[PDB]
Amino acid sequence: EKFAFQAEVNRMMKLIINSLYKNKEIFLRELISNASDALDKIRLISLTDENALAGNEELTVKIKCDKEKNLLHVTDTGVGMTREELVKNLGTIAKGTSEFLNKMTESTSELIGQFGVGFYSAFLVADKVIVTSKHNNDTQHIWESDSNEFSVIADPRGNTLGRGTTITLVLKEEASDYLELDTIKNLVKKYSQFINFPIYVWSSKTGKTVWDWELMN
Ligand SMILES: COC(=O)c1c(O)cc(O)c(Cl)c1CCc1cccnc1Cc1ccccc1
């Protein structure tokens, strides 16, 4: 169940980390951007497959802070990933990666977005990254990484997502402020403005305090 990262992924994790030390908040943009692209894919699939959205009818992005356990959750109802795609897409890279070797070493915020490798910016703010995904062609699995290795396991809780992906970030000590509602709300509203899917933040209202999904875009 344990795996090592491909060498090129190790180098890129260091490149992204070292070049975006100033602008850590971009991690939320990339996670939102990846969520939208996953929703696009299942929408395309639903054009030809009448059953594509049977595991989960809504097409949303839902973001949730868990302050007490130091966790941030980004859940989309996109196409999801099979066990094989978790291992392959997250631990290996392809194809033009090797031109992208020189391009990044030689601003770099736009580059990671173009080449679709923004996922690894999560390690700017997280000591551990956990990816829970459920694809129509497979059972729910869990991918977990501290960047030194990764493991993929079948999810003993079964199919809780229906369809899609949860990115769970165990936030670093100095990234504690990505646990505060107002920070997440303002970042989400900033980076979600042009996402063509609804994006919600689990938020508070006011004499008692009530929690519910608040639409941000
Ligand atoms: C299927 O996508 C997800 O489940 C998903 C998701 O639903 C949310 C996310 O934050 C991420 Cl990172 C993913 C995995 C994306 C990824 C990360 C690293 C390398 N390749 C890929 C391939 C890809 C797939 C769909 C959309 C965009 C990219």
UniProtKB/Swiss-Prot annotation:
Binding residues for ATP: 34, 76, 89, 119
Query: N6-(2-hydroxyisobutyryl)lysine-modified residues are where?
Result: 95
Organism superkingdom = Eukaryota
What tissue specificity is annotated for this entry?
A: Detected in heart muscle (at protein level).
What does the record say about PTM?
Phosphorylated by CK2. N-glycosylated cotranslationally at Asn-137 by STT3A-containing OST-A complex: this glycosylation is constitutive. In normal conditions, the OST-A complex together with CCDC134 prevent glycosylation at facultative sites during protein folding, thereby preventing hyperglycosylation.
Q: Which family does it belong to?
A: Belongs to the heat shock protein 90 family.
Q: What does this protein do?
A: ATP-dependent chaperone involved in the processing of proteins in the endoplasmic reticulum, regulating their transport. Together with MESD, acts as a modulator of the Wnt pathway by promoting the folding of LRP6, a coreceptor of the canonical Wnt pathway. When associated with CNPY3, required for proper folding of Toll-like receptors. Promotes folding and trafficking of TLR4 to the cell surface.
The UniProt comment on domains reads:
The SRT pseudosubstrate motif associates with STT3A during translation in normal conditions, preventing glycosylation of facultative sites until HSP90B1 folding is completed.
- Subunit structure and binding partners: Homodimer; disulfide-linked. Component of an EIF2 complex at least composed of CELF1/CUGBP1, CALR, CALR3, EIF2S1, EIF2S2, HSP90B1 and HSPA5. Part of a large chaperone multiprotein complex comprising DNAJB11, HSP90B1, HSPA5, HYOU, PDIA2, PDIA4, PDIA6, PPIB, SDF2L1, UGGT1 and very small amounts of ERP29, but not, or at very low levels, CALR nor CANX. Interacts with AIMP1; regulates its retention in the endoplasmic reticulum. Hyperglycosylated form interacts with OS9; promoting its degradation by the endoplasmic reticulum associated degradation (ERAD). Interacts with CNPY3.
The identity of this protein, by name, is Endoplasmin
Species of origin:
Canis lupus familiaris
Gene from which the chain derives: HSP90B1
**Which part of the full protein does this chain span, and how long is the full protein?**
74 to 337 of 804
